[PDB]
């Protein structure tokens, strides 16, 4: 929410930890793992009826928007 960078965060965390005796800012890997729930593609659900010509999975995250183009340079690239 304040656009802070990542190595930024770890340096800041080193600072606050070493400074005053307490663990105030949660470290990196636990941060990412705790965050991973909030992105799309985490929570199992169901659909009645099943959708038309749509995949059955629910875990897939960021799909490449190319949408599976045959890279063959004969067609429009």
């Amino acid at each position: 929410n304040t656009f802070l960078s990542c190595s930024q965060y770890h340096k800041m965390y080193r600072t606050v930890k070493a400074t005053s005796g307490r663990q105030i800012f949660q470290p990196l890997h636990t941060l990412r793992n705790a965050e991973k729930e909030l992105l799309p593609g985490f929570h199992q659900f169901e659909w009645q009826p099943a959708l038309k010509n749509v995949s059955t999975s629910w875990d897939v995250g960021i799909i490449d928007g190319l949408s599976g183009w045959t890279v063959s340079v004969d067609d429009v690239p």
Binding site: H43, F45, W47, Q48, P49, K52, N53, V54, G65, S67
Partner: protein, 232 residues
């Protein structure tokens, strides 16, 4: 997500459970697709956006089951497609662009017949019948002329591909009106109905004296384009 209401189990014409308070400030605007393309070239935009259209069309009927608060519950959906620029409005609607003669997006009168009477029109446009009119265009079952069919079918020339309720963009809604009052005053300084043709600079001289007039009383510097501030 604009609003979630309740339905169980009688008439429930409306029981708002959560109606979003600040639906404009971007802190409620979730992005879902991004492409390094331009707004103009219909080609790549359709080519990528297609899948999302298929999801739209496949979702509106079937119903969803989600485990929330320990309870597995059902969910239905509508869709109100508004967030498009007028250019994109008619582009997704397939209609001509942009300074055409079929100015409206819900009535089908042209420029002039809308100029005759202003406040007497009924809303007709909807995605389905625009699809229908395009089909009539394509088959052309009456061997009509170019312009004759163009008029009879109400300027439908390209198969639209995303149902959007063509609602007014509240944002500008004034800039045309602002410059219209500007023109009213520019033709009020110069007595118009006695002299039906102001000259090249007479119009500009009238705008100049009007500008220093409103600089005298309301103190507004000469502006080029009627953005929000000056218009308000």
């Amino acid at each position: 997500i604009m609003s979630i209401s309740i339905r169980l189990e009688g008439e429930d014409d409306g029981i708002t459970i959560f109606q979003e308070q600040k639906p404009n400030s971007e802190l409620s605007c979730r992005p879902l697709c991004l492409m390094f393309v331009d707004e103009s070239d219909h080609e790549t935009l359709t080519a990528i956006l297609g899948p999302v259209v298929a999801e739209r069309k496949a979702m509106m009927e079937s119903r969803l089951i989600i485990s929330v608060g320990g309870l597995l519950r059902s969910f239905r959906f509508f869709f109100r497609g508004t967030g498009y620029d007028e250019k994109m409005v008619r582009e997704m609607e397939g209609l001509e662009a942009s300074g055409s003669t079929y100015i409206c997006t819900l009535c089908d009168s042209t420029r002039a017949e809308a100029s005759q009477n202003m406040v007497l029109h009924s809303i007709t446009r909807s995605h389905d019948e625009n699809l229908e009119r395009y089909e009539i265009w394509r088959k052309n079952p009456f061997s009509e002329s170019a312009d004759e069919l163009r008029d009879r079918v109400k300027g439908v020339s390209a198969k639209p591909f995303m149902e959007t309720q063509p609602t007014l963009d509240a944002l500008h809604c004034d800039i045309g009106n602002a410059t219209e009052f500007y023109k009213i005053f520019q033709d009020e300084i110069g007595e118009v109905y006695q002299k039906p043709n102001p000259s090249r600079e007479e119009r500009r001289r009238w705008r100049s004296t009007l500008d220093k007039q409103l600089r005298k009383k309301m103190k507004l510097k000469p502006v080029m384009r009627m953005n929000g501030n000056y218009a308000r």
